[PDB]
């Protein structure tokens, strides 16, 4: 329907610069104004600005006045945030959306920001499969360990979305300045191993992608 | 800069019941031009952007279910839901949508009551792309049980086992309101290989007796 898909960079280093793009698709980019919106910590909203793509006209929150520029290109339908000096108060998700009559009614998916002198690390990714000696059960958890990763957006993929159900993302944790998270799924044991499972690692911040096939210990 | 203060924080409620959240302003939000108040109400599910729901305080976007309800004039909102369902866990923002700067409400979180459930315990022993990395992990997973409240307890050898352990929980789970959690136990290679006997033990209120999970890694 109504579509905003925001880009940039998820890594960037402190005091340099980073210009996040919103691309509009599904209405008329010009009838509408452009906010974006800081969520710092998974947790608190900021406005930060409002853009009328037919004048250039921009309300900044003072807060944000010299670290965020608004900024439209109408010939593509595509709204940019420029942040500057990029300092640790920085990193966090930056989401646009389209403010009318009916305030912000679409949002972006937003661009998770993270301010940084580390460099870009890509997971490994670990098989978790019943070993050993264990009950077939009636049902069987798999899982994948992903492991080592920085910055932190990373997702996982079950059998191209076929067992999205059953499924359990636990949030990473960050130790020694990389990432860890893993993946379960619960699959009925007339599927596994009998068909094959594979989990899917994306780690955009690296163009990195990972299958990781699930196999039996020995054979049945 | 108007100030938006949502009430209570948390609350928890079960399937079926009706809620009633408080977001109050300091000053007041009424266009008396447009005899319209513009306050917005927005739902965040976990790992999600934010969804808009209400806005003007009373008008629901297409699509919204009318379980979801919203009221009140001047400085004294609440949003109400009439027949809570475990889809509705997330935090509620609401928004002042009438003056510059546009200001949120800190969020107030819907969280779920179901029987208490126990877990469902499964054990993994270290992969052999993380031995050759020389890493090992044993991760147990507890999946859907309720309340939050686990207690893991890693042995290795009858032994007890507490510098390697990592926890983490998912959020709480849209379908049946259960919570998992993945613990993990990292060793090097060299020590996971000193010994034979591994171990993680759930002990919930759902139960006295422990559950308990473990392999022989010479068997693996």
Same mark, same amino acid.
């Given at each position: 329907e109504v579509q905003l898909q925001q880009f940039g960079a998820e890594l960037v280093k402190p005091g340099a610069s980073v210009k996040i793009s919103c691309k509009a698709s599904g209405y008329t980019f010009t009838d509408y104004n452009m906010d974006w919106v800081k969520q710092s910590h998974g947790k608190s909203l900021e406005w930060i600005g409002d853009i009328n793509p037919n004048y250039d006209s921009t309300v900044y929150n003072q807060?944000?006045?010299?670290? %965020?520029?608004?900024?439209?290109?109408?010939?593509?339908?595509?709204? !940019?945030?420029?942040?500057?000096?990029?300092?640790?108060?920085?990193?966090?998700?930056?989401?646009?959306?389209?403010?009318? %009559? !009916?305030?912000?009614?679409?949002?972006?998916?937003?661009?998770?920001?993270?301010?940084?002198?580390?460099?870009?690390?890509?997971?490994?990714?670990?098989?978790?499969?019943?070993?050993?000696?264990?009950? &077939?059960?009636?049902? #069987? +958890?798999?899982?994948?360990?992903?492991?080592? !990763?920085?910055?932190?957006?990373?997702?996982? &993929?079950?059998?191209?979305?076929?067992?999205?159900?059953?499924?359990? +993302?636990?949030? %990473?944790?960050?130790?020694?300045?990389?990432?860890?998270?893993?993946?379960?799924?619960? #699959?009925?044991?007339? +599927?596994?191993?009998?068909?094959?499972?594979?989990?899917?690692? %994306?780690?955009?911040?690296?163009? +990195?992608?990972?299958?990781?096939?699930?196999?039996?210990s020995g054979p049945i | 800069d108007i100030v938006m203060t949502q009430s209570p924080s948390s609350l928890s409620v079960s399937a079926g019941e009706k809620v009633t959240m408080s977001c109050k302003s300091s000053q007041s939000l009424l266009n008396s031009g447009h005899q319209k108040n513009y306050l917005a109400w927005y739902q965040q599910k976990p790992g999600q952007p934010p969804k808009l729901l209400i806005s003007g305080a009373s008008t629901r976007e297409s699509g919204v279910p009318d379980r979801f309800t919203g009221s009140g004039s001047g400085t004294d909102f609440t949003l109400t839901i009439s027949s809570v369902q475990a889809?509705?866990?997330?935090?509620?923002?609401?928004?002042?949508?009438?003056?510059? *700067?546009?200001?949120?409400? @800190?969020?107030?979180?819907?969280?779920?009551?179901? @029987?208490? @459930?126990?877990?469902?315990?499964?054990?993994? *022993? *270290?992969?052999?792309?993380?031995?050759?990395?020389?890493? @090992?992990?044993?991760?147990?997973?507890?999946?859907?049980?309720? *309340?939050?409240?686990?207690?893991?307890?890693?042995?290795?050898?009858g032994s007890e086992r507490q510098n390697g352990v990592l926890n983490s929980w998912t959020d709480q789970d849209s379908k049946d309101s259960t919570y998992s959690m993945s613990s993990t136990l990292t060793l090097t290679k060299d020590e996971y290989e000193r010994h034979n006997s591994y171990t993680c033990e759930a002990t919930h209120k759902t139960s006295t007796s422990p559950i308990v999970k473990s392999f022989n890694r010479n068997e693996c």
């Open positions: 807060k944000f006045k010299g670290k %965020a520029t608004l900024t439209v290109d109408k010939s593509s339908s595509t709204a !940019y945030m420029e942040l500057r000096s990029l300092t640790s108060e920085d990193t966090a998700i930056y989401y646009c959306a389209r403010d009318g %009559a !009916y305030a912000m009614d679409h949002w972006g998916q937003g661009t998770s920001v993270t301010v940084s002198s580390a460099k870009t690390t890509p997971p490994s990714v670990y098989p978790l499969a019943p070993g050993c000696g264990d009950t &077939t059960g009636s049902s #069987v +958890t798999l899982g994948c360990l992903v492991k080592g !990763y920085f910055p932190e957006s990373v997702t996982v &993929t079950w059998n191209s979305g076929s067992l999205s159900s059953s499924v359990h +993302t636990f949030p %990473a944790l960050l130790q020694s300045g990389l990432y860890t998270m893993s993946s379960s799924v619960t #699959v009925p044991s007339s +599927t596994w191993p009998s068909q094959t499972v594979t989990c899917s690692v %994306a780690h955009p911040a690296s163009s +990195t992608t990972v299958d990781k096939k699930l196999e039996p | 889809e509705d866990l997330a935090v509620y923002y609401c928004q002042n949508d009438h003056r510059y *700067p546009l200001t949120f409400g @800190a969020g107030t979180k819907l969280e779920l009551k179901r @029987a208490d @459930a126990a877990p469902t315990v499964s054990i993994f *022993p *270290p992969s052999s792309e993380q031995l050759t990395s020389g890493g @090992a992990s044993v991760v147990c997973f507890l999946n859907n049980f309720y *309340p939050k409240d686990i207690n893991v307890k890693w042995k290795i050898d």
